[PDB]
């Protein structure tokens, strides 16, 4: 009944407190800090005429995809700034995009409730809408790929989905979130994935079998971004309460909080470095902050965006960090 839920929640909190023998900050106290981190805008990708809401790097760490209110995705070659592709969108309201791990496909989604998949390597050359995935009843916040055949998707329906592009229909529906899911993060082995929602909670789900493995709370506002640690055993969540947090899958509770008195603005994007030592959180104070993931000390500041830093990404090889903002420019550091 409704009375036993509180008792079991108290039991879980007591178990978590018992497991909290020490703290991450007090263990990484003696390790040498990285110090000031300096980054310069190596590239400035121009060509968008409206606010940019999402991006995704390619597996080869060279090509990337960017989505803006222009109603057109752009596949950029980050090394030489050349626009490889410009895919017009049927619906101009897009707030998520994803670049397939094999590079063949590119997905996007927004207020049309559809994560449309375009085929980039078609025979005729010109990109075409390979699949239109419908079935969500809310604005589409993030749909990330798994392979050329499967995809996971998060919408404002407070539910996530696992679509088979070839068939075109959901194969698993993840329910349990109270608010709108606004973030996804696939595990490096692609076995589990975490989703942060507007109910100030991030749920770790199992892809293959479906049920919610774990739930992590601690935020005081809506969660706008989330990302696994490169090890795959931890993840960082950015919320509207101006604080990032690092939760651990095995420890089943948060380990460190990244916040400051100067920052009072929500986080729009969170990403990790290749080694996981740096945590790059894009703030809607028109900039980004690089935190020491083991110290919570602000190791650097990335400034140069006139408007809110909507999307942030770190390459697979960790060579560069690309930030896309509402001033319609991408910047590669």
């Amino acid at each position: 009944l409704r009375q036993e839920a509180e008792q079991l929640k108290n039991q879980i909190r007591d178990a978590r407190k018992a497991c909290a023998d020490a703290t991450l900050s007090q263990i990484t106290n003696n390790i040498d800090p990285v110090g000031r981190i300096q980054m310069r805008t190596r590239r400035t990708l121009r060509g968008h005429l409206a606010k940019i809401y999402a991006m995704h790097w390619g597996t080869d760490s060279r090509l990337l995809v960017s989505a803006s209110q222009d109603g057109k995705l752009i596949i950029w070659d980050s090394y030489t700034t050349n626009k490889v592709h410009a895919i017009p969108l049927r619906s101009s309201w897009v707030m998520t995009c994803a670049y397939a791990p094999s590079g063949n496909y590119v997905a996007c989604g927004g207020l049309d409730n559809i994560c449309s998949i375009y085929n980039l390597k078609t025979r005729e050359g010109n990109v075409r809408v390979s699949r239109e995935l419908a079935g969500h009843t809310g604005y589409l916040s993030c749909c990330r790929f798994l392979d050329d055949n499967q995809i996971v998707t998060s919408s404002g329906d407070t539910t996530c989905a696992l679509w088979d592009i070839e068939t075109g229909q959901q194969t698993t529906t993840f329910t349990g979130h109270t608010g709108d899911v606004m973030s996804l993060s696939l595990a490096p082995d692609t076995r589990l994935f975490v989703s942060g929602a507007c109910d100030a909670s991030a749920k770790l789900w199992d892809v293959r079998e479906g049920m919610c493995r774990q739930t992590f709370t601690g935020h005081e506002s809506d969660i706008n971004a989330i990302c696994f640690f490169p090890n795959g055993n931890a993840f960082a969540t950015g919320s509207d309460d101006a604080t990032c947090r690092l939760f651990d899958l095995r420890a089943d509770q948060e380990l460190m909080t990244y916040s400051h008195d100067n920052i009072i603005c929500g986080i729009t994007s969170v990403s990790f470095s290749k080694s996981g030592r740096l945590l790059l959180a894009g703030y809607d104070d028109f900039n980004c902050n690089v935190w020491d993931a083991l110290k919570a000390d602000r190791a650097g500041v990335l400034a140069g965006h006139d408007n809110r830093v909507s999307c942030l990404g770190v390459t697979d090889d960790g060579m560069a960090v690309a930030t896309g903002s509402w001033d319609s420019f991408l910047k590669i550091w």
Binding site: A20, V34, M39, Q214, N233, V314
Partner: protein, 50 residues
């Protein structure tokens, strides 16, 4: 309804010490710090971005 069984399944998971998890996190970070271009600035000769 389904919430009680879902939360029971959540509560019946295995647990680990926070110290061990933090130690593993530090071990991974210090093992892969050498392969992190962002942490240690790579020379511009090997940097594909100029």
């Amino acid at each position: 309804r389904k919430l009680v069984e879902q939360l029971k399944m959540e509560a019946n998971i295995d647990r680990i010490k926070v110290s061990k998890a933090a130690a593993d996190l530090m071990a991974y970070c210090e093992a892969h710090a050498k392969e992190d271009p962002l942490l240690t600035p790579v020379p511009a000769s090997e940097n594909p971005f100029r």
